[PDB]
């Protein structure tokens, strides 16, 4: 018996819709859902989406609480809709996919994936839920993630980390490494041998390798010498040039954290969402240096070194294509006298 | 005179309504009260309640700024309304009690406590304000707090800390220890000999005793050995089991802080309000372990040890009733082979 | 040319309106501007002003990103409006001046300063932009700032720090020290030999001199004799008296930072706005001490000492006038038996 | 160059978007679009839809102002979307079809009908606009209306009245009778030989035949005898039984108007929209008689008697199926002993 | 003592703001002012303006209830603001002038007309109020209306009708004919010998002369021959041509009413405000004829005849300039073979 008071009952007790029976009073006032707890109103939800408040409330209360891939991966895989589940985009505070399959009639573009309108739609299937693997087999456009091995299909390993309740993490108690399949027009795709982004934060930056701890601890020279980066312009690409007003370089998150620890600054996310490469509005509180738009990518420093060493230094200026998180990211390399000048990621 | 421009004048000058005469321009746009300071609009208030914006504004501006008991204590004492004052619930951003006595006609359920409508309602009387003790004597259902002794009444000591402008604290410059009287049906009631909660935070966790220093510093085995907590399952009850996906145990705030200092995690308050026992949505950022609903109580570790000692270890499954903050909290003791297994607080 | 979709295109790409050509879909829902990025809606803006959402969006997107004087300085200089630019007030999240000149027809009180409506209004001219100096010369009431020297005008040095994108800073890569001119009624005035506010914040406090580092490290008494402050009541005017409930003294930011680093407390800003003097609602979480309204000025401790050593120090009660940030601020000195008793800034 | 100030310029001058170049200030406040005419704000629009205000504004300003079929006819024909035009539903004050083709990117599922997403959707093509007939020929699912004859296709005549700017009418100066085609899965269908609804109103009911003027002027018995309606239950079916509390019969609009002229009553449209058959909440102000659900259809009285004569009087109870406005409307014929009990449009 | 509860008290009792002292509870929810009458809330006001709800409430409650000139006359006279009063614009349902003098500080651009900001602004002075005539004499830019004669000033006679609480009327009990003065730049101007607009509406049209009753009753040919406008084309200019789709002529209100009485139609006011000339979106429900923009003026038919007979028939095409309601209205005349063809008012 779908309703709203049942959903609020579930949210009050369990914190998410776990399909229990019961009803509680609800008041809706200005995009906000209140409930009466011992004679007083407690805010249960606050709509930030563009959907109606009760629609968004139901979508949130029915969100996924198991470790699921980060929304940027699903974007790159071209996932249009998630079958029998809701993916919540904690960065946007809004559901990741506009319609649903098998979730709620107020939003279901189709009750089941097999409806004709769902043929063009690239769906997402969760292997861990019983009955989705065969559905992915039968589905024309689809993406499946399985915990382990599925018979007759060659997997692609995903990133070491997934998102569990809006925090990304590498799981010990849980497995956050899925195997990614993909069908287009009914024929199983071959996913590229891609790199991944680590999805780290400045505030909680933890190095993930020895080169990274070296970067964090050693000065510019010590590090560049030890890892033989003489002709590769880390002092601009990764360390950033704060001498002039227009802040230069600084297109890797590790360099951001390195300058942050010595002197914190401010990053303005003017497009709050999840991408492989992100643009910020950087201002440096120490030097007074700033740049309007700063493409920033977060690879493993090890992998960034691997990518830049895989390049041809002789050419002055070409546009590189790098597969990151299942998509090609156009890098733009400039070399002076055959040694690397700049390697900004293309806008 | 009771107006809105007078209230805004008081708020602009003093920060709260201190009953002075003056007028100030006011603008109201979307649950928000603006005032014009030197030709530009400054936000004076923003309504988070369900009341009309000007009603809530007046209630906030007339809130109590002397140290007053935290709202959970009043809830446990069944206080319906507070006489001649407004209690503000900074956890909830809304006034604690729906109606008033002697505050303002737009909300006053009755001008004086002696009205017939106020007979069935438990009121709150503040001893520190002159004239409230006689009112409490005359009132049928009532709760009174005085700084010291009132003639002919047997007190009950309250918690060592009160709330002063929305931050709880133990007062040196000010007395935050009140004596709690209470009468029902006109007959003075005998309050139980209860324990109290300390109302601490993870971000600013301050140990209040030597056992707490030991817990924070000593490892699991050292602390358990020193305080002889062998058959008492602290390694699950208070330390938490993060090996499996479903995070286990961890129903004391001290254990939360101990786990937090090692690897910080994030807690979801899906019912923002003040209660003796609070339920959170816990996910562990290191292990990837999580639990949908996890009751958490903050006692003195000394007092938790005392109450777990004062139990019968033989029974397998028992429902324990403990009087905390003037209310009985059902604890669910499980013993394996006659020694403690689990002691989760009941839902 | 002007539109809303062009503005949103510029904001999506550059983060501010940089005058590019192109259009992007936009959705306006409850004081909020959304745009559709790869099939999903992303919040580009959220109106906090009292203006219409699209008006405020345009004003924000066209805000100034070069280092500009902090709005308090413009307030003190009586700047009514800024010519050919928008000054954004990040403290208020609203534009600093109600109308514009040469910005947008929906707001321009006049297209150019020379209109008769703009005659009675003090305008702000930016020397760094080509064509504003002659405009200031022709202007009747106006204020000009130049990086360097302008022929035939005697400058006044501004503060060492300006505001670049809402963070105040002393600029190395960029010049954040301007020279301030002012014409009233067509005659250039002589700006007073004033002192300046350092514009520092409590949480991330940085001493700017030797006396300040001494204050931060040395205890009370030691600092007092080293700088010979025996008869100058630094026990009250700076260090603050927390023995009684009525929190005493503490009217300089440095003393607040001193008290904070040892025991943090909460400052309640009831008038979010930038002024030279600011009033707070201080409560001390350690002692339980509080005061309703606490005027707090931020000086150089060096300069506060230089002020207090220039006083009569003999009379009981006089109200002195100090020229800070181009305005006279009444300090209220009390001396008992010819030694400083109190020196609170007048309300 | 798509914009919003251009649209408002067009609306201010022409009253609808007629593709002119020019711009006008706009203010958006609470679902309402204001513009400044000689220094004061005039409301240009007020959103009643569920769409964002600017989206709905653009859809309204680009609505169709030629005589177009009433939305109920399109509903019956299964029209999903209208190609290169916007149909406005003046009953609902909202656009008739959720998405658009070739109108604006904020709603276009596809710029042109030939897209694969537009394959499974029945589109509407307007013959009067040059280039739509060939598009209908090439379209998988489609509906076309032409003023006259299209080569190689056999038409179906539509209703003698269309809707021009939200008032339905039979056109003398303009041709409001179209010929209706239809392709399902690429094959042209044969539209049924159907009856039509007259789409009239009580407050301005005009008879459209001789039988109707007879009904309006003649008494009950005179009309029944003249047209030989002795055994056909017009007394209950078309005249209404107001003797009892539950208002009986009265399922044709002409009977409503006949009772209205004598003693006016009030009809409650609890589902404001356009359908062939409509349900009202009738209460009779004279007798005090009322009925909760009163299906009301507006046929030609001539056509209604033709349909009722085409029935079988012997059957006690069958469910007739009548094709009205290109859809089958089930009728409940109860006929006892050869005399009709009550026709009753099935619900 | 300005406030909001006092204003609501006045509105509840007197219906507008006299100035009685007394205060009443008020609730504000979504642009709406409620008050509690005998335990239930009653809507006292509903904001349609762009001002804050309480600002608009005070402006409305303090509106003028004496007969005052219609806002279009003030627009033509260039009145910027009204001194010591509020003119309410019932067409727009919003105050007529953005700022005030002597009304309330939230809107007072200046307390008195003599301030410097009020110098460049044409003000409106009400002769009937004691003290406004001397102010008008002293005023630099201003407009006065006296009920009779003022010493040393030559008046201009205004229209026979004024507006009394939002209905225009010719007054018997009250005198609604004022004498209009005007001092541009401190020098009294000479107002033109202008024609006037009758300000009538279709629903309650009333002829004001013999020619008008003739028009209403006489057919086309009878009227034209009796008043001998053979070569003047009333059959297009005034009677309207409904044969073709694009409605023709019909630019006088009397012609609208004459067509209305025969077969009523619908007029769309897409710019709701008051002007001498008004543009409508007209569609004819009988013929199906319509025009996108249909300028309509409402003179006395007597006066329209006088203006058209004051023309030069020989010219093929000129632009006539006619003074109506103190402004020049560019009429546009076409003559074919030396006799009048068309006389549309120019846009």
From Swiss-Prot, chains A, B, C, D, E:
Changing residue 236 to A: Complete loss of NSP15 endonuclease activity. Signal peptide: none annotated. It comes from the Viruses. It is found in: Host cytoplasm, Host perinuclear region. Its cofactor is Mn(2+). Likely affects Nsp15 binding to RNA. Residues 206-345 form the NendoU domain. Changing residue 251 to A: Complete loss of NSP15 endonuclease activity. Residues 3-63 form the Nsp15 N-terminal oligomerization domain. Residues 64-189 form the AV-Nsp11N/CoV-Nsp15M domain. The record marks 291 as: Transition state stabilizer. It catalyses: uridylyl-uridylyl-ribonucleotide-RNA = a 3'-end uridylyl-2',3'-cyclophospho-uridine-RNA + a 5'-end dephospho-ribonucleoside-RNA. The record marks 295 as: Uracil recognition site. The active site is at 236 (proton donor), 251 (proton acceptor), 291 (for uridylate-specific endoribonuclease nsp15 activity). Changing residue 114 to I: In strain: Omicron/BA.2, Omicron/BA.2.12.1, Omicron/BA.2.75, Omicron/BA.4, Omicron/BA.5, Omicron/BQ.1.1, Omicron/XBB.1.5, Omicron/EG.5.1. Uracil binds at residues 291-295, 342-346. Plays a role in viral transcription/replication and prevents the simultaneous activation of host cell dsRNA sensors, such as MDA5/IFIH1, OAS, and PKR. Acts by degrading the 5'-polyuridines generated during replication of the poly(A) region of viral genomic and subgenomic RNAs. Catalyzes a two-step reaction in which a 2'3'-cyclic phosphate (2'3'-cP) is first generated by 2'-O transesterification, which is then hydrolyzed to a 3'-phosphate (3'-P). If not degraded, poly(U) RNA would hybridize with poly(A) RNA tails and activate host dsRNA sensors. Homohexamer. This is Uridylate-specific endoribonuclease nsp15. It comes from Severe acute respiratory syndrome coronavirus 2.
């Amino acid at each position: 018996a779908m309703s709203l008071e049942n959903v609020a009952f579930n949210v009050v007790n369990k914190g998410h819709f776990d399909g229990q029976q019961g009803e509680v009073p609800v008041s809706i006032i200005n995009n906000t859902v209140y409930t009466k707890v011992d004679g007083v109103d407690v805010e249960l939800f606050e709509n930030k989406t563009t959907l109606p408040v009760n629609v968004a409330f139901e979508l949130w209360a029915k969100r996924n609480i198991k470790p699921v891939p980060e929304v940027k991966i699903l974007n790159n895989l071209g996932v249009d809709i998630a079958a029998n589940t809701v993916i919540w985009d904690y960065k946007r505070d809004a559901p990741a996919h506009i319609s649903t399959i098998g979730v709620c009639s107020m939003t279901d573009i189709a009750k089941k994936p097999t409806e004709t309108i769902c043929a063009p739609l690239t769906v997402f299937f969760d292997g861990r839920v019983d009955g989705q693997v065969d559905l992915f087999r039968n589905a024309r456009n689809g993406v499946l993630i399985t915990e382990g091995s599925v018979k007759g299909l060659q997997p692609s390993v995903g990133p070491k980390q997934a998102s569990l309740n809006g925090v990304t993490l590498i799981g010990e108690a849980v497995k956050t490494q899925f195997n990614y399949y993909k069908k287009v027009d009914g024929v199983v795709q071959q996913l590229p041998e891609t790199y991944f982004t680590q999805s780290r934060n400045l505030q909680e930056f933890k190095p993930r390798s020895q080169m990274e701890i070296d970067f964090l601890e050693l000065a510019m020279d010590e590090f560049i010498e030890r890892y033989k980066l003489e002709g590769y312009a880390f002092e601009h690409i990764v360390y950033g040039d704060f001498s002039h007003s227009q802040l230069g370089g600084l297109h890797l998150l590790i360099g951001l954290a390195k300058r942050f620890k010595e002197s914190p600054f401010e990053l303005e996310d003017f497009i709050p969402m999840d991408s492989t490469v992100k643009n910020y509005f950087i201002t440096d509180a120490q030097t007074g240096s700033s740049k309007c738009v700063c493409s920033v990518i977060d690879l493993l420093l090890d992998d960034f070194v691997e990518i830049i060493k895989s390049q041809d230094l002789s050419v002055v200026s070409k546009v590189v294509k790098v597969t990151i998180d299942y998509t090609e990211i156009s890098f733009m390399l400039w070399c002076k006298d055959g040694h690397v000048e700049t390697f900004y990621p293309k806008l």
